[PDB]
């Protein structure tokens, strides 16, 4: 049940956006408009695939498991699954 | 097009297992909730130039200033009696150019006496007058740069034989009147071109028969002729120029020493009545007034220094520039501050900033100092804030008990 | 703020119950009930000391703090508040001491010695007519500081020795002015 | 010991500032004259400090100059300690 | 590339903030994640800075909580190491290394925090100097030191504390000569109010780790040479030694007045931990021992009142037993006691500004913090005054 | 205290080597095999620039503060600053 997980994450402390990629850089389950979900998760998907190629260049058996970009205004947690990935933007405080 | 049915995989029974693992990673990362501790991490006054050129400003004390009421930022500074040479002129009315960025006096005018006042001929960009110390309000073509008066003044009882501390214009092309006000207990509303006979020369006398010696008077905004005369010691006088109301109407004080600076202002964002005239006085104070209230808002007691001038241009009319005898250009806002100065600057050394006048309908402050020195300021931060009713709202709070 | 509510409530409720418009007794039980209200007063005094230390903590110089202090000098009367905020009061009196001594220095480096002489000459006030204005100028500022002296410490202004000596020296300075 | 305790009880400040001055003077002299250029630049203050300390150590055990000698060496040691921290910081980093 | 360019950039006055933020960020990422009644909370140990270094004094931070200045009297072990250590540690992060080391040029004694100051670690030293550290700098050397003149401090400053609000913030640091000096928290080159606690007999009173009642008064409890707590002022005619609390037989070691009032009366009562082996409850206006506690095994190095529960106190001893005592229930026995590993002569006791946590300065090095949730601000305002009254009734046999 | 920084940050378990590479792509601070980590430093800095472009392009007022790259074999945590960067590989210990 992803619906209870999303609804439980609505009133959580500082949630900027709960989305998830769905078609290899092209999300479907969108809680925002077209750019914030699709274009931003597309850039995140391409850059995390480049990070996969980066650590793959370090060691091909060393793929990626999780990504956490914490910044001044946002903390983007990326959960890389097999085909589609996951992008969740949260507040830093 | 991305997919055909986008909600089928969201409703599928196997794709949600992938979402279950992804949300498991979500719950794995959301349980941190740890922030970075700081540990002592930590993370305007556009002063323009100064027209100081001793070729005609050699030890000459600046008398009242006058912004370019006809020119674009090309002010005039009247000069006090200087005895640097006996037969040479005492005061020299000098004009400069802020628009041209120089230091030498643009137009030099030295009559026989000391120009206690100097002003522009309204709607006459080719004429500047100077109310001298001996009483000869003397005319000069401004752009001709003639260092000899083109039109002197007959020293008569109806005219001025007294130092005209403030000569100024009031209205436009039809209502322009060269009103020279002196210690004669009079105003002399001369004409701009002819200065051999005053058109409306009236007395400035209250119930007493003594000739009230004026001291830094001013004119209201919009030419409503309600000129406020600063007597020999305070005594804010309300006066008119035409009809039976002409002359002295009523007095009021919030000080004792002679008034130093007083002006008016235009729109405060089309809110206030625009005639909030704040005087200043030699008894070390700066008090706000209005023609409707005999004693409104607080007297900013500018102690430790002989106050000289205040101005508040319509670009954010809540911006007056008060000074002292020890050089403190304190310009601020009552809509923002209470009594403390927002943009306060202790000028170099201890200059006696005689006149600190903002650029009317703009912002740059002409400064007439102890010596012939025209230091000019600006802020670059005190923008004309809209809804500047707080200047009046906070003022009414201080006018209750 | 809410101290006014406490004042009104305990004021009527205990002031009109001490004897309840009945006297001529030993007047000690009556005094005990008003002592109960005095305890209510002390509680309000603590509330007022918190409130006024905040507003009087926002301003601290001899003039700025004195403005808010002057707007509440009547609250600055009783010794439970006065002796407690006496810390700030002594600081204000010391600043007024420095200010009056600066006024002495102002008459030292007076008007003809300052640029004001010539600046007054712009308005034509020579030292015979301007130094006298400087004298009454410092007289006016001294009157202001005497109000500072007698209102930072209200009816107990004489209790503060510094303010009393400032009054003496400043009035002798008025005579010099 | 009773006379020493009575004298220390009256004005212990001399001997106390002397001990304070000894540890601070070691940390002052080292970080002050630790370099050639640092000692040559601080020689202007070191001359007066050495003159006061030498006149105090020479005319020591006086009824009217013991407290003055200890206080002079202590003030010079503390001033040399502050200037020592500044000189050592400018010489090293 | 070259060693000259690398060593010049690594030591440039650009990488000071880079090394500070690099250590801050890598130490921030030290919290290992996962991807699949006395509590005895934590111990503080530093290898290059806390070993054979006895703790001079501890101090809780009123601003930026969970911070304590562990001052250290650097022994004669490592002379090349900068004498005196002031380590700031973190509780909220749960780290094993000290957050910022603050060494000095002398064995730091009683280093405390500075109220209304976010980056100002103040602290007396063995050289009689109340050195000052800044949290912004990377160099752990104190940039501001104290003079040693006749008006300035002479004895090693064993107690420095702040008194006054934002209008007149004073840095009252006292030497054992009775020389109390109010210093400014910005410039440290000249004292503001310097004087000596002159006494009738033995003027130079060996004061010891004084405090102040809640309200920041000028009166400090002087732990004299033999008890004789002198509540003394700094200004006025009462400046210097004013009141004497005698009826004691030893030098006080840790003395703390009433902390923040939690749920009882103001309780103008201080407490004396001393070499007399027994803690003693006193009042600031009694001049009689209000109550002498049980003779603990060893001295009583420190004591402190909790702001949450202002009716109890924690004390220590040479055997290593921290004893907190409440008197609302107990009369002659301690409330909650716990020991530290081995037998460390526990030097300090400092309750956190938020209360219910105890910083215990151990023998040498380690600093053990405790946590409790049982003793809270229970509104027993009347029972505390009643027990104090029964103490004042039973003490007079 | 540069050596103190290396010894203290290397004291934490999982940290294979404090290979701090600057913005120039040169290993300004390293403790491991220089030729193997030189390519890793250049690659990781290029992708650090990719992450900087990510942060500066998704949001205008955002600044990259810290990065966590949980790989399959290690946890490559990147510590980017305003002037230079830091690369530290910490295994899930």
Curated annotation (Swiss-Prot), chains A, F:
Intracellular or extracellular location(s): Cytoplasm, Cytoskeleton
Listed Pfam families: Robl_LC7
GO molecular function: dynein intermediate chain binding; identical protein binding; microtubule motor activity
KW Acetylation (keyword) present: yes
Main localization category: cytoplasm
GO cellular component: centrosome; ciliary tip; cilium; cytoplasm; cytoplasmic dynein complex; dynein complex; membrane; microtubule
Organs and tissues of expression: High expression in heart, liver, brain and pancreas; moderate in placenta, skeletal muscle and kidney; low in lung, prostate, testis, small intestine and colon. Isoform 1 expression is up-regulated in 64% hepatocellular carcinoma (HCC) patients.
GO biological process terms on file: microtubule-based movement; visual behavior
The UniProt record lists the keyword Transport: yes
Top-rank taxon, per record: Eukaryota
Keywords, ordered alphabetically: Acetylation, Cytoplasm, Cytoskeleton, Dynein, Microtubule, Motor protein, Transport
Entries under SMART domains matching the protein: Robl_LC7
Family listed: Belongs to the GAMAD family.
Primary role: Acts as one of several non-catalytic accessory components of the cytoplasmic dynein 1 complex that are thought to be involved in linking dynein to cargos and to adapter proteins that regulate dynein function. Cytoplasmic dynein 1 acts as a motor for the intracellular retrograde motility of vesicles and organelles along microtubules.
Self-association and partners: Homodimer. The cytoplasmic dynein 1 complex consists of two catalytic heavy chains (HCs) and a number of non-catalytic subunits presented by intermediate chains (ICs), light intermediate chains (LICs) and light chains (LCs); the composition seems to vary in respect to the IC, LIC and LC composition. The heavy chain homodimer serves as a scaffold for the probable homodimeric assembly of the respective non-catalytic subunits. The ICs and LICs bind directly to the HC dimer and the LCs assemble on the IC dimer. Interacts with DYNLRB2. Interacts with DYNC1I1 and DYNC1I2.
Identification of the protein by name: Dynein light chain roadblock-type 1
Organism of this sequence: Homo sapiens
Lineage per the UniProt record: Eukaryota, Metazoa, Chordata, Craniata, Vertebrata
Swiss-Prot record, chain B:
Effect on the protein upon substituting residue 296 to A: In NEDMIBA; likely benign; can rescue neurodevelopmental defects in zebrafish morphants
Record has RNA-binding as a keyword: no
Subcellular location: Cytoplasm, Cytoskeleton; Cytoplasm
Gene Ontology annotations for the cellular component aspect, listed alphabetically: centrosome; cytoplasm; cytoplasmic dynein complex; cytosol; dynein complex; microtubule; vesicle
WD repeats: 57-106, 110-150, 159-200, 209-249, 254-299, 302-342, 348-387
Disulfide bonds: none
Major location (coarse): cytoplasm
Domain of life: Eukaryota
Chain's role: Acts as one of several non-catalytic accessory components of the cytoplasmic dynein 1 complex that are thought to be involved in linking dynein to cargos and to adapter proteins that regulate dynein function. Cytoplasmic dynein 1 acts as a motor for the intracellular retrograde motility of vesicles and organelles along microtubules. The intermediate chains mediate the binding of dynein to dynactin via its 150 kDa component (p150-glued) DCTN1. Involved in membrane-transport, such as Golgi apparatus, late endosomes and lysosomes.
Name this polypeptide is given: Cytoplasmic dynein 1 intermediate chain 2
Organism, as annotated: Homo sapiens (Human)
Gene expressing this chain: DYNC1I2
Full protein segment contained here: 208 to 621 of 638
Swiss-Prot record, chain C:
Effect of residue 82 to C: In CMT2O and SMALED1; slight increased BICD2-binding
Segments for region (Interaction with DYNC1I2): 1-177
Segments forming a coiled coil: 27-50
Localization in the cell: Cytoplasm, Cytoskeleton
Domain of life: Eukaryota
UniProt comment concerning the protein's domains: Dynein heavy chains probably consist of an N-terminal stem (which binds cargo and interacts with other dynein components), and the head or motor domain. The motor contains six tandemly-linked AAA domains in the head, which form a ring. A stalk-like structure (formed by two of the coiled coil domains) protrudes between AAA 4 and AAA 5 and terminates in a microtubule-binding site. A seventh domain may also contribute to this ring; it is not clear whether the N-terminus or the C-terminus forms this extra domain.
Entry's disease: Charcot-Marie-Tooth disease, axonal, type 2O: An axonal form of Charcot-Marie-Tooth disease, a disorder of the peripheral nervous system, characterized by progressive weakness and atrophy, initially of the peroneal muscles and later of the distal muscles of the arms. Charcot-Marie-Tooth disease is classified in two main groups on the basis of electrophysiologic properties and histopathology: primary peripheral demyelinating neuropathies (designated CMT1 when they are dominantly inherited) and primary peripheral axonal neuropathies (CMT2). Cortical dysplasia, complex, with other brain malformations 13: An autosomal dominant disorder characterized by global developmental delay with impaired intellectual development. Some patients show signs of peripheral neuropathy, such as abnormal gait and hyporeflexia. CDCBM13 is associated with variable neuronal migration defects resulting in cortical malformations.
Protein family membership: Belongs to the dynein heavy chain family.
Protein name (database record): Cytoplasmic dynein 1 heavy chain 1
Source organism of the structure: Homo sapiens
């Amino acid at each position: 049940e992803v619906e209870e997980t999303l609804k439980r994450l609505q009133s959580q402390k500082g949630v900027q956006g709960i989305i998830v990629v769905n078609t290899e850089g092209i999300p479907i389950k969108s809680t925002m408009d077209n750019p914030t979900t699709t274009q931003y998760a597309s850039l995140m998907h391409s850059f995390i695939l480049k990070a996969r190629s980066t650590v793959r260049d370090i060691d091909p058996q060393n793929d990626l498991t999780f990504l956490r970009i914490r910044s001044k205004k946002n903390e983007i947690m990326v959960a890389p699954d097999k085909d589609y990935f996951l992008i969740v933007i949260q507040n830093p405080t | 097009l991305t997919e055909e049915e986008k909600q089928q995989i969201l409703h599928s029974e196997e794709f949600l297992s992938f979402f279950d693992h992804s949300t498991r990673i979500v719950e794995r990362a959301l349980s941190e909730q740890i922030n970075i501790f700081f540990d002592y991490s930590g993370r305007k006054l556009s002063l323009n130039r100064q027209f100081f050129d001793e070729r005609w400003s050699k030890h000459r004390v600046v008398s009242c200033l006058d912004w370019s009421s006809q020119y674009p930022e090309l002010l005039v500074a009247s000069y006090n009696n200087n005895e640097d040479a006996p037969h040479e002129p005492d005061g020299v009315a000098l004009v400069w150019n802020m628009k041209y960025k120089k230091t030498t006096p643009e137009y030099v005018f030295h009559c026989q006496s000391a120009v206690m006042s100097a002003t522009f001929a309204k709607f006459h960009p080719n004429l500047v007058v100077g109310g001298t110390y001996s009483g000869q309000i003397v005319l000069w073509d401004n752009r001709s740069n003639k260092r000899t008066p083109v039109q002197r003044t007959p020293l008569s009882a109806a005219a001025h034989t007294h130092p005209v501390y403030c000569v100024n214009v009031v209205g436009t092309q039809n209502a322009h009147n060269l009103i020279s006000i002196s210690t004669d207990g009079k105003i002399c509303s001369w004409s701009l071109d002819m200065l051999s006979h005053p058109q409306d020369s009236m007395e400035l006398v209250h119930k007493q028969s003594k000739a009230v010696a004026v001291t830094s008077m001013s004119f209201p905004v919009g030419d409503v002729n309600n000129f406020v005369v600063g007597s020999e010691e305070g005594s804010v006088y309300t006066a008119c120029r035409h009809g039976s109301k002409a002359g002295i109407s009523e007095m009021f004080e919030g000080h004792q020493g002679p008034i130093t600076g007083i002006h008016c202002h235009a729109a405060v964002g089309a809110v206030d009545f625009s005639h909030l005239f704040v005087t200043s006085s030699f008894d070390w104070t700066v008090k706000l007034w209005s023609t409707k209230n005999n004693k409104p808002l607080y007297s900013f007691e500018d102690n430790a220094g002989y106050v000289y001038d205040v101005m508040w241009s319509p670009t954010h009319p809540a911006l007056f520039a008060c000074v002292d005898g020890m050089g403190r250009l304190d310009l601020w806002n009552l809509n923002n501050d209470t009594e403390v100065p927002t943009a306060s600057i202790s000028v170099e050394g201890n200059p006696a900033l005689n006149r600190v006048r903002w650029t009317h309908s703009g912002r740059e402050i002409a400064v007439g100092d102890s010596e012939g020195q025209i230091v000019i300021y600006d802020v670059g931060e005190q923008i004309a804030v809209p809804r500047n009713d707080e200047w009046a709202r906070f003022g009414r709070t201080l006018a209750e008990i | 703020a809410n101290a006014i509510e406490e004042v009104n409530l305990a004021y009527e409720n205990v002031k009109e119950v001490d004897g309840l418009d009945v006297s001529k007794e030993g007047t000690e039980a009556w005094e005990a009930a008003m002592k109960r209200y005095d305890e209510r007063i002390d509680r309000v005094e603590t509330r007022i000391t918190a409130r006024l230390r905040d507003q009087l903590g926002t301003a601290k110089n001899a003039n700025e703090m004195f403005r808010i202090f002057s707007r509440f000098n009547a609250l600055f009367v009783r010794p439970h508040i006065r002796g407690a905020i006496r810390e700030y009061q002594t600081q204000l009196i010391q600043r007024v001491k420095d200010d009056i001594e600066s006024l002495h220095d102002k008459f030292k480096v007076q008007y003809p010695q300052s640029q004001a002489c010539k600046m007054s000459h712009v308005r034509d006030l020579p030292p015979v007519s301007g130094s006298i204005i400087w004298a009454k100028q410092i007289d006016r500022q001294l009157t202001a500081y005497m109000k500072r002296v007698e209102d930072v410490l209200g009816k107990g202004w004489e209790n503060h020795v510094e303010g009393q000596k400032l009054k003496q020296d400043g009035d002798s300075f008025r005579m010099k002015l | 010991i009773v006379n020493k305790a009575h004298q220390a009880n009256q004005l212990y400040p001399f001997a106390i500032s002397l001990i304070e001055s000894v540890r601070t003077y070691e940390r002052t002299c080292e970080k002050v004259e630790e370099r050639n250029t640092i000692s040559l630049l601080v020689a202007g203050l070191k001359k007066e400090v050495q003159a006061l300390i030498a006149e105090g150590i020479a005319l020591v055990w006086e009824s009217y100059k013991l407290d003055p000698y200890v206080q002079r060496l202590a003030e010079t040691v503390f001033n040399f300690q502050e200037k020592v921290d500044d000189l050592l910081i400018i010489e090293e980093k």
